[PDB]
């Protein structure tokens, strides 16, 4: 209706669920479920003089648990890649997420992406901000985000990308 949806992909522990409810609660919990299979929750917005309301998905990263959050791929009008600066493997593994999104999601290399690298609190990193951001360019060229789900920094700014692209 007014109701958007996008989802949150990426390896297990780079921070999905804490970004979530960091953008909607503005709280960084540390005792957060450990959910097998999928999880969402809404986000009130107002665009435009309009009431909106963003539905933010995200899932279990394993990949034993694909059969479990594929079937809530559809309908998805976004897609935040996630990895987690502190963690390469975490970063190898982008490709690998996109290409899972677009083989179940069915929705075109205009699709919505946007790409949050987290954890930047983290002093400590694997991956640097310019290989990131190399990544990004060669890949779609999409929009890259380093964010902290834990001191907030730049994740209502990164979720609000996603809305421009997905009302754009
Ligand atoms: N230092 C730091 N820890 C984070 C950040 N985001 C999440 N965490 C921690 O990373 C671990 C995995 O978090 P989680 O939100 O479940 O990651 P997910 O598996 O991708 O959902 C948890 O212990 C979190 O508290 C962050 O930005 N910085
Ligand atoms: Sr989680």
Redesign the pocket.
Known sequence: SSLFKVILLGD??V????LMNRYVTNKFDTQ????IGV?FLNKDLEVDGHFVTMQIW?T??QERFRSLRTPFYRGSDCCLLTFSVDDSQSFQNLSNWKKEFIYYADVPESFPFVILGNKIDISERQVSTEEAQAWCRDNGDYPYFETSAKDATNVAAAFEEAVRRVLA
């Open positions: 297990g522990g921070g999905k669920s804490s957060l479920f450990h959910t999880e995200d279990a990263g």
